[PDB]
Amino acid sequence: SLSSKQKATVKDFFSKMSTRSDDIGAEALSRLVAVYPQTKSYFSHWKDASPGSAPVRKHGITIMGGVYDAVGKIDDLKGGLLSLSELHAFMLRVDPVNFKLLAHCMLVCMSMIFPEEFTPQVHVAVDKFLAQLALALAEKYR
Amino acid sequence: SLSSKQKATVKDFFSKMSTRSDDIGAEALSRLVAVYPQTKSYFSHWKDASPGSAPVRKHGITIMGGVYDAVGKIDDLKGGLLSLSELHAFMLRVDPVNFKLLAHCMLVCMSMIFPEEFTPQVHVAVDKFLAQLALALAEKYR
Amino acid sequence: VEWTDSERAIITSIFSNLDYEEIGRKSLCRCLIVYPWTQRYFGAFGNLYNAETILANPLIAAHGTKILHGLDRALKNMDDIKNTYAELSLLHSDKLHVDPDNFRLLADCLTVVIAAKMGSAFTVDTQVAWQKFLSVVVSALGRQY
Amino acid sequence: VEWTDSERAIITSIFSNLDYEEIGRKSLCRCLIVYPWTQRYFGAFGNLYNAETILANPLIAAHGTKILHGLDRALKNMDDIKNTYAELSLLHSDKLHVDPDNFRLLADCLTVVIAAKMGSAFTVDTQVAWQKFLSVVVSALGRQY
Ligand code: HEM
Ligand code: HEM
Ligand code: HEM
Ligand code: HEM
């Protein structure tokens, strides 16, 4: 749970990375699939993985779209992402551990692209946000 | 998050354990301290971690107090356990990886003591309860 | 790892008393009910619609058994546990994809099944020994370095 | 695992952009602030009261460098990672009882400090190799079975 300060930190940082949103998402999903090769099994029905491959690049933009939507509803994530949880946790039965790995990836891209801005304090607020989002997605597991 | 059928399974399973409260906590606690010795650091002010130990038995009962309370507060465990979170997550700085080591041992004591009645169904609901209980206690880390 | 003599005695006792068909069935059934994302890797095992169906599903209970015999290959070879499970480790992580943490989830469930069957005879000392055994088994079944 | 030969080139490339006197201090500074329960394990270090205290605390900086120097040792002993860290394993996992998940935390914070410094130079396959090197060390630091 984020304090009100921490939510402001997250609304303010996500706004500052809007113009590089797509590139963060594509880098993140690309790194997820290169760095943690077990994640490709979830995407085996596509005809590609890893950067350059546009399917990974446009699925990364979709993920970030979901991420930017979670920011907008940062005061009730459990109730507001119920459809996405149904899909990830119930339909696809994505293993819960894959969320901490995707989050880490997104964190290194954010730091990679906004190094002066991504201070320990921003890191904490965002880390906490991503975990809370993972847990909103976890609502329909069982 | 806990569904109605979950809350109900927990409430009516806790009824069995009213008498046994002293016994269950102490046993679970004895088992966490023996099987998972990383946990001992937090109790280094006790002269004995055996079962039978005077502090293990006093603290076992206390743990189940907190567990009853939590059965009370099943609708808002995040709101409900703020004092206990402050204690564990901030003052004591218990590594959150430990919570499941206690939780596991409670489920072992509930299975020995209530075999055939402690079904997979009841296990779903009790595990969900204890997993949320740990999230609840985790509120005041950062 | 150094096994003591009592640990070896305790581990072989645990097994001796267990119906591999009934421990298998109950353990895997509980894993899939308690941790339902693990059903992803068992789509070809009939209907997994709810607790009751799963608990009544024969090819689940047959695969259960095959896990408890898998565990025997470590009861029978307690000092060569990494190498005994190397063919399996390859199979699980690559041809099936399962993450390291699911092996713990099923071990937690085997422990709960055995705690229930052994009743009071599942002592602290027994649990410590069982757990060490499982830690090693679980460490051997995951990816190596 | 078996190293590919660009896996090694990519690892030394990363390590060649790490000044341990600057990076060591910041990787640990950052773990203590982001994962603050990790502070308990370093009782000796004195004031960790706040971020200002974390970053100004000479014992944190100095240890950051020891830890990061330790991490860098497998680069020179890469097919013997396990025996290279067997004593550190016993120190962290047998004596001090650091939960293994904290190893992942420090290392995740390190990578994040690295990505800030290297920029896009740090590619996706560079990072994969890097993470293969971290997962091997961490795996070596855990309780050895
Ligand atoms: C913060 C984390 C994540 C967010 C915000 C997110 C968001 C999304 C969104 C918005 C969709 C499209 C849903 C739609 O069709 O309307 C989706 C689909 C999907 N996500 Fe995620 N996701 C996340 C994490 C993950 C992870 C960790 C995995 C697997 C490792 C995963 C696997 C998938 C898959 C397989 C699909 C369906 C792809 C397809 O249509 O073929 N997601 N996700
Ligand atoms: C379901 C999980 C848990 C519950 C419900 C729980 C509950 C409690 C309660 C009710 C107290 C006493 C509160 C007070 O004095 O105001 C307490 C104290 C404590 N708990 Fe926990 N606890 C849990 C898990 C843990 C774990 C996993 C550890 C360590 C590995 C831990 C370590 C402690 C310690 C050190 C104290 C202080 C004991 C003392 O007075 O010396 N707890 N806990
Ligand atoms: C103590 C833990 C485990 C042991 C000892 C074990 C043992 C085995 C054995 C002996 C087989 C048969 C392979 C063969 O025929 O060559 C097998 C197959 C399999 N295991 Fe496991 N396993 C364990 C844990 C898991 C877990 C946690 C999962 C999934 C979450 C899993 C999923 C599977 C699957 C999908 C198969 C393939 C079965 C088939 O195709 O019929 N196992 N396992
Ligand atoms: C990649 C991860 C890590 C590496 C490579 C590493 C390396 C080291 C090294 C080289 C030492 C010096 C001890 C010796 O000379 O043998 C040490 C000490 C220590 N480490 Fe770590 N470490 C890591 C992670 C952790 C983490 C995550 C924690 C706690 C959260 C931890 C807690 C300690 C403590 C308490 C000491 C003793 C400090 C003292 O009192 O002097 N380490 N570590």
Residue numbers in the entry:
A (entry chain C), B (entry chain A): 2 to 143
C (entry chain B), D (entry chain D): 2 to 146
Could you give the paper's own sentences about this structure?
Here, isolation of the dominant isoform of haemoglobin from Atlantic cod caught in southwest Norway is reported and its X-ray crystal structure is presented. The full genome of Atlantic cod has been sequenced, and about 70 isoforms of haemoglobin have been proposed by the EST translation of the genome. However, sequence similarity within the α and β forms of cod haemoglobin is high, simplifying the structure-identification research challenge. The potential use of haemoglobin adducts as potential biomarkers of PAH exposure in Atlantic cod is under investigation in our research group.
The crystal belonged to space group P212121, with unit-cell parameters a = 62, b = 103, c = 199 Å. A homology model of tetrameric cod haemoglobin (made for pre-crystallographic studies) was used as a template for structure determination using molecular replacement. Phaser was able to identify two tetramers in the asymmetric unit [Fig. 3(a)]. The two cod haemoglobin tetramers superimpose on each other with an r.m.s.d. of 0.51 Å. Differences in conformation are primarily located in the loop between residues 45–60 and the C-terminal loops. Eight heme groups could be located in the electron density. The heme iron appears to be pentacoordinated in all subunits. The side chains of the histidines in the α and β units have conformations similar to that observed for perch haemoglobin, with distances of about 4.0–4.4 and 2.1–2.3 Å between the histidinyl N∊2 atom and Fe for α-chain residues His60 and His89, respectively, and 4 and 2.1–2.4 Å for β-chain residues His64 and His93, respectively.
